[PDB]
């Protein structure tokens, strides 16, 4: 349904453009100002996305951003591309350094669900946010431009919970 | 189709974000540095996005960008919208002034009609796009952050055409 559209939305138009510039970028970070080499995109399957993720989880605290990508895009002179930095932190230790953020379709997916005309129902909300992770993981297994610059963590809040731990248990390659 | 998913996105995720803004970013370029006070957005039905305005017609020339618009967005600190002023020419006298893009999500269409594992038709592109241009005008319509902040072109080139023509019709108001 909706979400098929949505993850090949966020490979064409994001991470078909952001991922083969990414390692440039972070290398040009670490010799400038290590943060881990990989993406990773939060995928609450709950589609609740807060905008300030240091307010998800007081162990989450930004660091900084990287160096930004532009590019000319759809008549747009120079679109900006901008990533932010993460520590991870464990029992009051920096345990993790990342490039973290998000999936911002399922923002979509959770404001079509409040929308009348939308025609989504709310209950729908679960099903979709898991087919887009499905779709989304079968088109990173096979594209070029990544899997091995990205990781997907998509999780479900029980039916207590620490967002940095299950990152930190990816993170542990 | 999937059209319905991109158009919801294309507002949820950007029209009613940067809408409610536009105006006082234009009247801050005015005095500062008239623009018309509506984003224009090209919906070409064959989904054909060039990423550079000027090469498609000439008489549509880039002039300057509006001052970005920042916000923290699904854990990226400060993500940037921006927008890119054109002049519109005719006979080679300066006929509108406006800010004019393209939507994106048509880059998507395009992009799902080539690649084997997206399961779009490439004959399906123009329906798709048709079915795009259609809910997002039901969506503007009724949207309170708009209709009267942005104007949609939508066209077709023929089965010889200006696109500066095109747009220019719909400046005068
Ligand atoms: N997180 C994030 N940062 C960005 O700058 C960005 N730009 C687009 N998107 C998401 O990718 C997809 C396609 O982009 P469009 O087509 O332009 O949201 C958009 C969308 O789902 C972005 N998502
Ligand atoms: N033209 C354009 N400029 C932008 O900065 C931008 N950011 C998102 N989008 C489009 O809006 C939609 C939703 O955004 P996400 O969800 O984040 O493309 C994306 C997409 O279709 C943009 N489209």
């Given at each position: 349904?909706?979400?098929?559209?949505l993850?090949?939305?966020?490979?064409?138009?994001?991470?078909?453009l952001?991922?083969?510039?990414?390692?440039?970028?972070?290398?040009?970070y670490?010799?400038?100002?290590?943060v881990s080499?990989?993406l990773?995109?939060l995928?609450?399957?709950d589609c609740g996305?807060?905008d300030?993720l240091?307010?998800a989880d007081?162990?989450?605290?930004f660091?900084?951003?990287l160096?930004?990508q532009?590019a000319?895009r759809?008549?747009?002179?120079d679109?900006?591309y901008?990533?932010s930095i993460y520590?991870?932190?464990?029992n009051?230790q920096?345990?993790?350094?990342?490039?973290?953020?998000?999936?911002?379709?399922l923002?979509?997916?959770?404001?079509?669900?409040?929308?009348?005309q939308?025609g989504?129902?709310?209950?729908?909300?679960?099903?979709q946010?898991?087919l887009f992770?499905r779709?989304?993981?079968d088109i990173?297994?096979?594209?070029?431009e990544?899997?091995?610059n990205?990781?997907?963590?998509?999780?479900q809040?029980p039916?207590?919970?620490?967002?940095?731990?299950?990152?930190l248990r990816?993170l542990?390659?």
């Amino acid at each position: 349904n909706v979400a098929h559209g949505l993850a090949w939305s966020y490979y064409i138009g994001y991470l078909r453009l952001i991922l083969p510039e990414l390692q440039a970028r972070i290398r040009t970070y670490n010799q400038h100002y290590a943060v881990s080499q990989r993406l990773y995109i939060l995928l609450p399957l709950d589609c609740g996305v807060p905008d300030n993720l240091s307010m998800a989880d007081p162990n989450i605290r930004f660091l900084d951003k990287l160096p930004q990508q532009t590019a000319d895009r759809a008549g747009i002179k120079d679109r900006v591309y901008s990533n932010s930095i993460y520590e991870l932190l464990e029992n009051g230790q920096r345990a993790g350094t990342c490039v973290l953020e998000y999936a911002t379709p399922l923002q979509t997916l959770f404001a079509m669900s409040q929308y009348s005309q939308a025609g989504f129902s709310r209950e729908d909300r679960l099903e979709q946010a898991k087919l887009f992770c499905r779709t989304l993981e079968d088109i990173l297994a096979d594209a070029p431009e990544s899997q091995n610059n990205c990781r997907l963590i998509a999780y479900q809040e029980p039916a207590s919970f620490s967002l940095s731990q299950e990152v930190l248990r990816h993170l542990r390659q």
